[PDB]
Amino acid sequence: PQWTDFLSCPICTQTFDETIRKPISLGCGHTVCKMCLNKLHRKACPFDQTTINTDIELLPVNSALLQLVGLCSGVEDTKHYEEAKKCVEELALYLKPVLSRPMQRKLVTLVHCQLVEEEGRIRAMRAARSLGERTVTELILQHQNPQQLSSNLWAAVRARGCQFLGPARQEEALKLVLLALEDGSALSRKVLVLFVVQRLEPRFPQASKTSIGHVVQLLYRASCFKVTKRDSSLMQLKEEFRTYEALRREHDSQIVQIAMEAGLRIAPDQWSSLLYGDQSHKSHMQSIIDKLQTPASFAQSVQELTIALQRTGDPANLNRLRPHLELLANIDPSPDAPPPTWEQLENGLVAVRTVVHGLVDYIQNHS
Ligand SMILES: [Zn+2]
Ligand SMILES: [Zn+2]
């Protein structure tokens, strides 16, 4: 069940061959060898316990996998099917040795999709979208300067009227804010700022009233405040935010959103480093970034890419991928998504191959 060995059957442990031990992908995303399918004599898949279509009889074998070793609904739909199958096969050849590890993981996910079933087709679409999105975020990093990245981030933060004082200093300030507001007190801007300023243990570049005001502004943008006015504006900490864990979570998330609006793709380890100074929060930041991902964020990313691509001119003519990327972003990731039609499946996979090929071409010929 390890994604790394896809050329071997999970059950029989032996590598796949073209005659007897034959790769057969099921609807659940697992590929088991034919001999084992015959040998099972049980309805479902031992790994997930999902029911099946019918036997080995109606299930085709993965050719896409076998390359690395050595007519139901009518003519139109099966033309679509054959084309799609061909696409997956063409992608699989990148798995022989070029692509990055996280990319090829999603490729492997794509290969294990059985295209003669609804489940497998849905999985194929999701894997397609994931591959597209990952390609976009890998094209953005090429046009993104890693050296001055932090500088740009903090610039974006300061431009919104917010401020980050550093990993320790910010913890201090936030715990002072929390101290004042944890019981439900309603303080105005100046009162909260004055309360926090005086309690700051002196370090050298001491935050002034304005800086702390900016940190408070950051907490206000994150919607931590119940804000009221009797005709001075009073701010209260919502019941769920009166813990340091929660409040800090919202704080971090807000800064991440600032990074997104400005178009900075930043890894969770880098976030843990910037915000906390250490690596302890990597999983925390991971959860934060994942929680922040809307299905509309793919399209957003495509647009951002187009912006950066408008800056440099276009040495690689990547705009040719624009109609392909827009199609990949237009498919519902939600479980509420209807199963794809045959034309949708074909167009999706075609889009995927065009895009991935484009990515490789860019990396090799333009840098
Ligand atoms: Zn087996
Ligand atoms: Zn399974």
| Helix-helix angle 209-221:244-261, to 10 degrees | 90
Structure tokens at 93: 């050849």
Ligand nearest to the CA of 31: 2
Stated resolution in angstroms: 2.8
133 neighbors 301 (Cβ within 8 angstroms): yes
Helices and strands in the chain, H and E counts? 15, 4
CA–CA distance, 111 with 349 (Å, rounded to integer): 11
CA–CA distance, 270 with 105 (Å, rounded to integer): 22
β-bridge partners, 237: 225
The DSSP secondary structure of 289-317, one letter per residue, reads HHHT--TTHHHHHHHHHHHHHHHS--TT-
Binding residues for Zn(2+): 9, 12, 28, 30, 33, 45, 48
Q: Which residues surround ligand 2, an ion (CB under 5 A)?
A: 28, 30, 45, 47-48
> Which residue, chain included where needed, has tokens 């969770």?
268
Q: Which of 105, 117, 112 has the alpha carbon at shortest distance from 88?
A: 112
Question: Could you tell me how far CA 144 lies from the centroid of its own chain?
Answer: 18
Handedness of CA 139, 276, 252, 285 (dihedral sign): positive
First-residue to last-residue Cα distance in the chain: 37
β-bridge partners, 233: 229
Q: Compute the distance from residue 22 Cα to the ligand 1 centre, in Å.
A: 9
β-bridge partners, 225: 237
Torsion angles phi and psi, residue 26, rounded to 5: -100, 180
Q: What contacts 24+ positions apart, CB below 8 Å, involve 283-286?
A: 284/249, 284/252, 285/252, 285/256
DSSP secondary-structure letter at 52? -
**Domain segments of the chain as ranges:** 1-70, 71-145+294-367, 146-238, 239-293
CA–CA distance, 291 with 252 (Å, rounded to integer): 12
The one-letter amino acid at 315: P
Question: Could you tell me how far CA 304 lies from the centroid of its own chain?
Answer: 15
Structure tokens at 47: 């790994």
The DSSP secondary structure of 171-215, one letter per residue, reads HHHHHHHHHHHTT---B-HHHHHHHHHHHPPP-SS---HHHHHHH
55 neighbors 22 (Cβ within 8 angstroms): no
Helix (H) or strand (E) holding 237: strand 233-237
Q: Compute the distance from residue 1 Cα to the ligand 2 centre, in Å.
A: 9
Q: Which of 146, 153, 169, 154 has the alpha carbon at shortest distance from 276?
A: 169
CA atoms within 13 Å, Cβ hemisphere of 206: 10
Burial class (CB in 10 A: 0-12, 13-18, 19+), 120: buried
Binding residues: 9, 12, 28, 30, 33, 45, 48
CA–CA distance, 202 with 204 (Å, rounded to integer): 6
Q: Which CA distances in Å does 195 have to 223, 233, 249, 275?
A: 21, 16, 23, 24
Q: Compute the distance from residue 26 Cα to the ligand 2 centre, in Å.
A: 7
Question: Could you tell me how far CA 148 lies from the centroid of its own chain?
Answer: 23
Handedness of CA 236, 241, 243, 245 (dihedral sign): negative
All residues at 6 or more sequence positions from 47 whose CB lies less than 8 Å from its CB, including other chains: 1, 10, 28, 30
CA–CA distance, 119 with 217 (Å, rounded to integer): 47
Q: Which CA distances in Å does 217 have to 102, 280, 354?
A: 37, 27, 45
